[PDB]
């Protein structure tokens, strides 16, 4: 940072939060960022003994390294890191009680993460020409 004059040591935003500082001892300059905060989207089925968890917009490496370790299987879906559900987006369902967004559904037999395709075209094998 180059903006700190001799009498200045704190960088403020328009709302009066501190967003940076210059250290009085070392003269080193740092930006300050908020620690991550967020919800877990848990999908539950009455016939199940566990939850399928979605950490929206988080990659599984970040969840495991910075939030919490777990024994559950996990994968990086389009929506974020999914725990305790099998990655089956190649499979598709026409009805879904556990709608996650963007055409993704949680289905329960374990949990599966699958695509939601509620409508089809009717197909005929007749010539176009």
């Amino acid at each position: 940072a180059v903006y700190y004059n001799s009498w200045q040591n704190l960088l403020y935003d328009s709302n009066g939060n501190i967003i940076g500082f210059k250290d009085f001892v070392t003269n080193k300059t740092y930006n300050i960022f908020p620690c991550y905060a967020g919800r877990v989207s848990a999908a539950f089925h009455q016939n199940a003994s566990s939850l399928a968890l979605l950490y929206r917009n988080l990659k599984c490496s970040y969840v495991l390294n910075n939030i919490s370790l777990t024994t559950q299987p996990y994968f990086d879906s389009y929506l974020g890191c999914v725990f305790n559900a099998d990655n089956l987006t190649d499979y598709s369902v026409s009805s879904c009680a556990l709608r996650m967004g963007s055409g993704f559904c949680v289905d329960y037999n374990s949990y599966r993460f699958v695509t939601f395709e509620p409508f089809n075209v009717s197909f005929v094998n007749d010539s176009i020409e």
Partner: protein, 439 residues
Amino acid sequence: SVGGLYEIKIPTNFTIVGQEEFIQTNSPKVTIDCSLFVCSNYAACHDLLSEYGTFCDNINSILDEVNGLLDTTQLHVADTLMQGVTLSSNLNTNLHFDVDNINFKSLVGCLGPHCGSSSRSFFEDLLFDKVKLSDVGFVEAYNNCTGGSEIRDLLCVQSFNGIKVLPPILSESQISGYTTAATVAAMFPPWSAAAGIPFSLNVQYRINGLGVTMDVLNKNQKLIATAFNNALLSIQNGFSAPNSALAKIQSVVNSNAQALNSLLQQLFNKFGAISSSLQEILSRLDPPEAQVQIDRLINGRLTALNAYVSQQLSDISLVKFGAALAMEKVNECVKSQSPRINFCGNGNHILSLVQNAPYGLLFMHFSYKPISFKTVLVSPGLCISGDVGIAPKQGYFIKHNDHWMFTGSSYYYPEPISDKNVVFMNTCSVNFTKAPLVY
């Protein structure tokens, strides 16, 4: 009237014009964590907020109902697009993109799952590229909040304060697949969206229904097709200008972003407390007085949430009204041609088409536009033979070469009077022009 005749301007030439209409059918699914918004990470606040009891449960319950209404609405719109659509399994949009000299290549995406999420058409691609915060735009913005970027996106600050936009239950790529399928359903047999006939014949019969003789239509077929695809190109090019449909689409994103920004700014109001920061209160006062200050902030923030909830319910009522109109236009302008004059856009409406759009549908309405006119003397009826009356169907009687002839009302073309273009009456009315020599 001079004698029995009136002066009328009848068109002598015409073109097809295209008009865009965006209709909003969806909105950003805002979700609030009331506990995280009101109290952040501070245990002394979470304690006091728990003594307010159900207020956060009520806020969450209303927003979950509102978001369920949006999800149900998006399903009903997709069902309306897919209703009755039948396609040939031989259809391949990589080769099959134009028919009868009319070009649909820009309106048709990838068809079938072998191409993946590429089912967005060139027209829809061109429309989505001008709107940053679509569904995929929100998913990418929130994906970047843990990227360590020096850019302080307000969407990240909102999400860390418990204000977040969820994706819709169907992705815009699925809806773009449904609008693609509903479009090609008018192009090729069985023509399930085009009354079971070829698209060019449907256009021709629709123009004829305006009072244009078929004899000009089926000789000008090339000029009609070129007018049609020129109108479509003019609609596409019109998004580069300050377009009113694109302005409406951006206003949906802007009004949402403004409302979320105002809700975030409510965290920085003091509401008559010593500070708007829970960190400052809890580092200045002990529990007996810190409670009195924090309780003012809790009342301020819970009042702001109740105000935002009441505005959100009011807005989603307008989104349901807009979606009901869009389903009615898909049914009565795109899949069929209902006998309602200004419903499917202004003027002499020929036919309509639909494409996906951020938070809605974009309709293209095509209309018969007169280019030049002839002033002519017309009779609204004739009294003929044994005082039998005749009236013209979708047209007028005219003197041509000192002989009575018919012409269509939307295009000047004198043709002989016959039972094909006439309504009979057993008695002619008064002020019908006398013509004993006819028939």
